[PDB]
A paper describes a structure:
Crystal form 2 was obtained when a hairpin DNA was used. Crystals of both forms were dark blue, indicating that the different DNA ligands, each with a Cyanine5 dye tag, were present in the crystals. However, after the structures were solved, the DNA could not be built into the structures of either crystal form, which resulted in a higher Rwork/Rfree gap during refinement. Some broken stacking electron density was observed around the 2-fold axis of crystal form 1 and a solvent channel in crystal form 2. The unsolved electron density in crystal form 2 was not in close proximity to the active site identified by the metal center. This indicated that the DNA was present in the solvent channel but bound promiscuously. Crystal form 2 contained two [name] molecules in the asymmetric unit and, for both molecules, residues 3–361, except residues 54, 299, and 300, were refined in the final structures. The three copies of [name] were very similar to each other, with a root mean square deviation (r.m.s.d.) in the range of 0.37 to 0.60 Å. The restructuring of this loop and the coordination of Cys-256 induced a ∼40° rotation of helix αF from its position in SNM1A and SNM1B. The same position of helix αF was also observed for the structures from crystal form 2.
Author numbering: 3 to 53, 55 to 298, 301 to 361
Amino acid sequence: SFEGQMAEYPTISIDRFDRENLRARAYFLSHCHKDHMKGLRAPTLKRRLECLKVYLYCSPVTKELLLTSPKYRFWKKRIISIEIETPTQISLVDEASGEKEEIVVTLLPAGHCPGSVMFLFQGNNGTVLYTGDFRLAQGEAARMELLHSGGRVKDIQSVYLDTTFCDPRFYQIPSREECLSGVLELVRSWITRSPYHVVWLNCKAAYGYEYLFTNLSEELGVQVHVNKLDMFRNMPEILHHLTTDRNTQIHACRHPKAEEYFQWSKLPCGITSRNRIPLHIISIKPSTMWFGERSTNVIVRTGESSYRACFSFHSSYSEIKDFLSYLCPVNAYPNVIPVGTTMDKVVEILKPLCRS
Ligand SMILES: [Zn+2]
Ligand SMILES: [Zn+2]
């Protein structure tokens, strides 16, 4: 994984808050996933804040979701939200020496989960882009204005990028539109059969499924059952598509025993029936599917009442190549070395997409 520090601007820490990141002169959070929040509520950091003034920068939506959780509220006076595509000047103060450094940061949508951004940094040590976690369609980098000067791609020294699926194995992954379309039609065909036909969307406990929930709710006029929606209380574009009311045909609720429940025709929220009549439940499990270069269906049946539906939080190998090729940075560094590859193989895929 990425240890928080870009070589070009090492006095700021991104998506990593422990060890050497404890001495950072400014903090950045790309998005509100635990993989990118290590040490963020470490007592040693709660104290290092109080002893003097360092800030955490992030998207307005990221600030809302972060400050919703009780454990992070100590950040409240120390978070500065930056609007999307708004170049902003930040002052970095060396505590020991009193030296001031000036950097500009620009937040670009990363298409990962709500509030997820890339950080574009400009200053004395070159231009660098930290992608965080990102899913962008092929051709999307050419349509980002603030990666351009006078219709020309900006001169970028280093791109630090989401290499979750950086291998030709994950050559092609269906778009979020194709994924949504597949889920929409499976759900539609099921819940229109009668009022006792309900869907359980088996989703991990992590932001990034809302796009699914909000679009199912618009097209079908049915709110999605969730354990908690208070994180979205000041976000009407999401909130109004969700409910804590169990009386709905679409559930994204969660329970430790959800699997044994489903076996007994019980939703995680513990209902088996409506007006004494047992419900008809299908499970749909969003899960990453991929296709090799020289090798179909986003919906896979797994049982009489169970389905896997293609869904990805990270770009395909093809989408990585497209993004990085277009930017043609001097350097490209992987934010992650997945379990099934190595630094040398990922560098071997990245180096040819760089300048020279
Ligand atoms: Zn993530
Ligand atoms: Zn439920």
